[PDB]
């Protein structure tokens, strides 16, 4: 008759997990290499996916922490003394403008909350509430997008969470300054409904529930084959 | 309970291609509880584990401190243990597994292109 407090939904699902690692440069190059983008979802990290897909419906708040580490870049014309690096982190709600390049107008939109962060301080954090039209997120959706019974199968538009975009505020004239971003994601005030059997087959697609047939368990020698045995000894005489 | 304070002091390294102007050095300190993943190299995945509390510290501030509670399965630490690890009366003598406290791992957050910084 010992405690069960560690098996509750809160203590089971509120563990921070690293869900994205990206890199971006601070100088000339291909524009797509000068910013980092991520669409918020729980279907790309298999370890977190297996935990969220024990329940059919979920309702939680998001807490996102960004760890940013920058270093100098080898080449010619190295910077002898740089003041400090500042980074801009922008959260785009569902339906907001999304940048197609760095130094775009969407970076200065008043509907997108942004964080300006200087090197040396504590990691930046933000919290997003339960932002959806429906009354819950749904891990499994059996249905179509249009009512013609045709379209994308298994896609629901009621569980969009937005995007995260990170770039360098500074304009650098001497040298390049590569930076690396890590995203830590955590649910809070979690509520879950309608439990489901955990998955057996390995994941094959982030968008689908497709699978390969897998054996229901691990093989055994015989039906009456108990595990191994013990040799004769002082107790067994 | 354990209270641990870390004093970190950095200096430039002699050689060629000395850094003319570096912004600041940041250090990562990670405490690994008993049974958690332990890095086998720098820039490993265990450095980004969500079960290992970490401190990110910038040069110039006050020394970093952490406090660990009484983390053990039993009800006390034991300085002297007369017994074995296995019940076969064989194994390592004098070793108890009930007084593990974890590990501490420290590394440089920054990636340095010009010079070395011991």
């Amino acid at each position, epitope marked *: 008759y010992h405690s069960r407090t560690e098996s509750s939904i809160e203590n089971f699902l509120c563990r921070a997990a690293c869900v994205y690692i990206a890199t971006y440069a601070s100088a000339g190059g291909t524009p797509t290499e000068r910013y980092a983008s991520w669409r918020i979802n729980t279907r790309q990290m298999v370890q977190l996916r297996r935990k969220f897909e024990l329940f059919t419906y979920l309702r939680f708040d998001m807490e996102i922490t960004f760890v940013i580490t920058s270093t100098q870049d080898p080449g010619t014309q190295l910077a002898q003394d740089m003041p400090v690096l500042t980074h801009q982190i922008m959260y785009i709600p569902p339906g907001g403008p999304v940048p197609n390049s760095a130094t775009d107008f969407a970076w200065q939109s008043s509907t997108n909350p942004s964080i300006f962060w200087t090197e040396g301080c504590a990691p930046a954090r933000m919290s997003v509430p339960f932002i959806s039209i429906g009354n819950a997120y749904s891990n499994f959706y059996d249905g179509w997008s249009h009512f013609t019974q045709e379209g994308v199968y298994g896609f629901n538009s009621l569980n969009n969470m937005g995007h995260i975009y990170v770039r360098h505020v500074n304009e650098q004239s001497l040298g390049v300054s590569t930076s690396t971003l890590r995203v830590y994601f955590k649910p809070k005030h979690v509520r879950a409904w309608v439990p489901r059997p955990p998955r057996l087959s390995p994941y094959v697609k982030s968008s689908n529930v497709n699978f390969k047939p897998t054996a229901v368990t691990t093989e055994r020698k015989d039906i009456n084959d108990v595990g*191994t*045995l*013990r*040799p*004769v*000894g*002082y107790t*067994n*005489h | 309970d354990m209270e641990i304070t870390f004093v970190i002091t950095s200096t430039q390294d002699p050689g060629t291609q000395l850094a003319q102007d570096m912004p600041v050095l940041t250090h990562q300190i990670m405490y690994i509880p008993p049974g958690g993943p332990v890095p086998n190299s720098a820039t490993d995945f265990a450095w980004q584990s969500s079960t290992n509390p970490s401190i990110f510290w910038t040069e110039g501030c006050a020394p970093a401190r952490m406090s660990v509670p009484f983390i053990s399965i039993g009800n006390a630490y034991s300085n002297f243990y007369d017994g074995w690890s*296995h019940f*076969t009366q064989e194994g390592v003598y004098g070793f108890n597994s009930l007084n593990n406290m974890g590990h501490i791992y420290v590394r440089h957050v920054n990636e340095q292109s010009l010079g070395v910084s011991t």
Partner: antibody
Amino acid sequence: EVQLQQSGPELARPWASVKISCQAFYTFSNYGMQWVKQSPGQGLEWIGPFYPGNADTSYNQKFKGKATLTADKSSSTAYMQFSSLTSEDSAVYYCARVVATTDFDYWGQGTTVTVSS
Amino acid sequence: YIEASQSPSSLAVSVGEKVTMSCKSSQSLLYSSNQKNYLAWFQQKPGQSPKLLIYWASTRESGVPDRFTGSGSGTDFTLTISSVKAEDLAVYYCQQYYSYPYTFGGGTKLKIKR
């Protein structure tokens, strides 16, 4: 007239474990398995009995604290372990089996344990 | 019942040639807690009492000449003699003392080739 076999004679070394097995062709209910010591200098001396269906193992006082016995009834193989092995313990170990409480009916085949140091 | 199979035939080789033999066991003979292999290679002079060569498959019996070396881990069990002799005529078994019963091997005569 049932045959009887064993693990076999192997040239061992001093202080090296030598297990002398013994096959079976009977059941394991209230019967007995044991051995002897066949050395012309030392004559014949028993080493220890094993009793299937009784869970009893005994050793002689001449080897008590030195030798141990074990067996697996299902596997049909009986062990006779030995420790602190000497060089003069070499003998033609005979596997004796009794299907009765008090008798000696079937004898073994013969195995040698002579070593060279 | 747990038994073990020796080589299909005898050595049937010349005198003075190193011989290698194996004993195929029908089940595992390693106790993982102690890492001990419960099997021994036996030797019975015709007409006298038998006597093994090496017990535990890694500890040669005291008094046994250095020619016999027993090996083999897990189900397999082997033995090697770097100098076969004409006066070592016997029947070679690979007996197991792991669990009841203590079953013997299959037999191996030292025949004549000269």
